[PDB]
Design a binder for this molecule. Structure first.
Ligand code: MG
Ligand code: MG
Ligand code: MG
Ligand code: MG
Lengths: 118, 57, 100, 233, 68
RNA sequence: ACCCGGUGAGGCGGGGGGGCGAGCCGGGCUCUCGCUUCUGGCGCCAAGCGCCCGGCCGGCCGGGCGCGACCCGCUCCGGGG
RNA sequence: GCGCCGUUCCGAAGGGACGGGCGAUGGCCUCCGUUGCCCUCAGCCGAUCGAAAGGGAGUCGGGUUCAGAUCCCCGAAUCCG
């Protein structure tokens, strides 16, 4: 057989996969960012209640490790309501605040009266 | 227009319909055609004079 | 008493060359079979000014003999070389100007 | 029948004329450093003046003799690990109700039965990797009077015994059916190695220049010979 | 045994055989890196004197030290 | 050994073969050559030939190998040493 | 000695893709993907970092707060995948 190139590259060897003879950790770690862990409480602020009454959203206080996708899935699961969008800001207190806009077939005032905030 | 806006354009916005169209201008295309023709015709002439130099020798 | 300035120049870091807008190492073409046995043509693409150099350089473009690929070179322009000029290089090249 | 559309289109691989084909270039590869090292190690064994105690291992028992020696040494291979367990089960059955000769192997056992003159033939590998393990052993076989030979392969001398390599392999005893064939080996091997031993002790090795360098010296010497011989007429 | 022959052969370092071997090996060791693994002892005899047994888990590295 | 330079370590050294010159009787020999100089063009991923092989009905459709692209070698070529 | 020098220099520095072949699961096992193996093809330039003023696709108008708006709301768009 011939050498086309003046170079010698390292030839491509077979390499296998991990077929481990014991798992390293015994069981997987449970998700400690639940749906309950990720929504702490809503805001009951007159500014937040203005936002609820007018702009059809819900102002929650959220764990700081959360995505907008995770906040949307948690609001969808805990209160059984679909969401148009989620806007997040982190406060100078340190908490993350989520402005959870609702799909307009739901009233934010009805779900706020459901969960208690008025 | 700016080079990443060229993803947005249609094909005919970005070239002209000629050989080397949108990459090379018309004047240099026609002189490149003439040159490519005349160099090869000169090579034919040198070939023929080579054969005749084989004929005289 | 102090380290004098001529000693300080060898450490660098303030006395290094200003090579930001320079164009390249102006070299001849490397040795190969065409340089050593015959010759090889290349055209002068453009003649250019290198910063920190009184000589003008010359982008000379050669056709690579083993690959379909054009190789481009920075010669130092001999005087009278123009753009669009064929430049030859090899053992069998002719003895005219800008022809190595 | 023929098609005038089919054209013969030759390529002119002249200088500057047409692009070079992908031809064989094994001579100009940038090899890895281990390959580069193990090649010019052999080149240095050809360049340098190799002393005769190392040079003597280059002389190898030839092919038609090596086949007869390995044919005789296949008769007396040591028992395999499975056959050990089979013989132990056989003696176990006899308990529940004269050992045959083998090859000796290793430099240690073979040298101790060269001094004791229990060896009748000593096979030596030629490529033992620290050579200092076996450098003395031809001269010791010469002194004790034991026929020694040198085979190509520590690898294949390590296949009589069931291993990877083996430095030396001795003959202590053989059987009566395979007695005269060992004598026919011992005669040729003895007259090729032991009886011709001062010529081995003085025979320096290597010291051959490169074929390019030999060719340049040869061109100068043949030019001087021609330019001196043409003057006399 | 062979080892007393290899011992007194490696005491004869000025001889032609041993100057040849030390020169060729020193070339070959200089071509390698400053620390690398020998797959086996170069001197089996000296390694055995110094504690080494040829079993699994004894390792030999050949390393160089720049001199002076 | 050791050092320096170049390179994507790409045609190194012998030898065949081919052509062109000088000298003797179509022949042996020494040496040179080995394919690109009128132009700001193009140039790769083989044409051709030779021998094998497989599926379908001498025809059809997909394959292989060697020439093409000379052989052999122990330092990648060079310069020091 | 902690480490240092060095950044292409004394490296087997490629884990990728078009096609051809082998098998294996999945879907009205059609045809396509998911792979695992073989043949082929493959340059680049040195891992990585380094600009809230450099390069860098694509959002504007109106209304709203005690304090935020090209970010919310209404209306018009638009880029990339
Ligand atoms: Mg157009
Ligand atoms: Mg960065
Ligand atoms: Mg920036
Ligand atoms: Mg910027």
């Amino acid at each position: 057989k011939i050498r086309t190139s003046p170079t010698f590259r390292r030839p491509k060897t077979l390499r296998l996969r991990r077929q481990p003879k014991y798992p390293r950790k015994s069981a997987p770690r449970r998700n400690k960012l639940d749906h309950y862990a990720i929504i702490k409480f809503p805001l009951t602020t007159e500014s937040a209640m203005k936002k609820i009454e007018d702009n059809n959203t819900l102002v929650f206080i959220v764990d700081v490790k959360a995505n907008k996708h995770q906040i949307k899935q948690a609001v969808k699961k805990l209160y059984d309501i679909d969401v148009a969008k989620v806007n997040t800001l982190i406060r100078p207190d340190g908490e993350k605040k989520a402005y959870v806009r609702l799909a307009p077939d739901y009233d934010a005032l009805d779900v706020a009266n459901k969960i208690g905030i008025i | 227009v700016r080079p990443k806006v060229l993803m947005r354009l249609s094909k005919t916005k970005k070239h002209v319909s000629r050989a080397y169209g949108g990459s090379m201008c018309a004047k240099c295309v026609r002189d490149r055609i003439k040159r490519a023709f005349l160099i090869e015709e000169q090579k034919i002439v040198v070939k023929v004079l080579k054969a005749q130099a084989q004929s005289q020798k | 008493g102090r380290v004098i300035r001529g000693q300080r120049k060898g450490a660098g870091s303030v006395f290094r060359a200003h090579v930001k807008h320079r164009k390249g190492a102006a070299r001849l073409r490397a040795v190969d079979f065409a340089e050593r046995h015959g010759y090889i043509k290349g055209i002068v693409k453009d003649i250019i000014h290198d910063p920190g150099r009184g000589a003008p350089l010359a982008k000379v473009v050669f056709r690579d003999p083993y690959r379909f690929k054009k190789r481009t070179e920075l010669f130092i322009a001999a005087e009278g070389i123009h753009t669009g000029q064929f430049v030859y290089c090899g053992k069998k090249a002719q003895l005219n100007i800008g022809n190595v | 029948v023929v098609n005038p559309l089919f054209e013969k289109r030759p390529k002119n691989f002249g200088i500057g004329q047409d692009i070079q084909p992908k031809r064989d270039l094994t001579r100009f590869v940038k090899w890895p450093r281990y390959i580069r090292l193990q090649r010019q190690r052999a080149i240095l064994y050809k360049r340098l003046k190799v002393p005769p105690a190392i040079n003597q291992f280059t002389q190898v028992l030839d092919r038609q003799t090596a086949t007869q020696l390995l044919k005789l040494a296949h008769k007396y291979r040591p028992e395999t690990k499975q056959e050990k367990k089979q013989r132990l089960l056989a003696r176990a059955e006899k308990k529940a109700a004269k050992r045959p000769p083998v090859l000796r192997a290793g430099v240690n056992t073979v040298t101790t039965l060269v001094e004791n003159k229990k060896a009748q033939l000593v096979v030596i590998a030629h490529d033992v990797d620290p050579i200092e393990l076996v450098v003395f052993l031809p001269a010791l076989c010469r002194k004790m009077g034991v026929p020694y030979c040198i085979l190509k392969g520590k690898a294949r001398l390590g296949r009589l015994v069931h291993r990877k390599t083996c430095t030396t392999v001795a003959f202590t005893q053989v059987n009566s059916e395979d007695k005269g064939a060992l004598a026919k080996l011992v005669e040729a091997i003895r007259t090729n190695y032991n009886d011709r031993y001062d010529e081995i002790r003085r025979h320096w090795g290597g010291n051959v220049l490169g074929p390019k360098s030999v060719a340049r010296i040869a061109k100068l010497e043949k030019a001087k010979a021609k330019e001196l011989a043409t003057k006399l007429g | 045994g062979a080892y007393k022959y290899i011992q007194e052969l490696w005491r004869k370092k000025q001889s032609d055989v041993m100057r040849f071997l030390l020169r060729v090996r020193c070339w070959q060791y200089r071509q390698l890196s400053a620390l690398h693994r020998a797959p086996r002892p170069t001197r089996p005899d000296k390694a055995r004197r110094l504690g080494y047994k040829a079993k699994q888990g004894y390792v030999i590295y050949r390393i160089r030290v720049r001199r002076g």
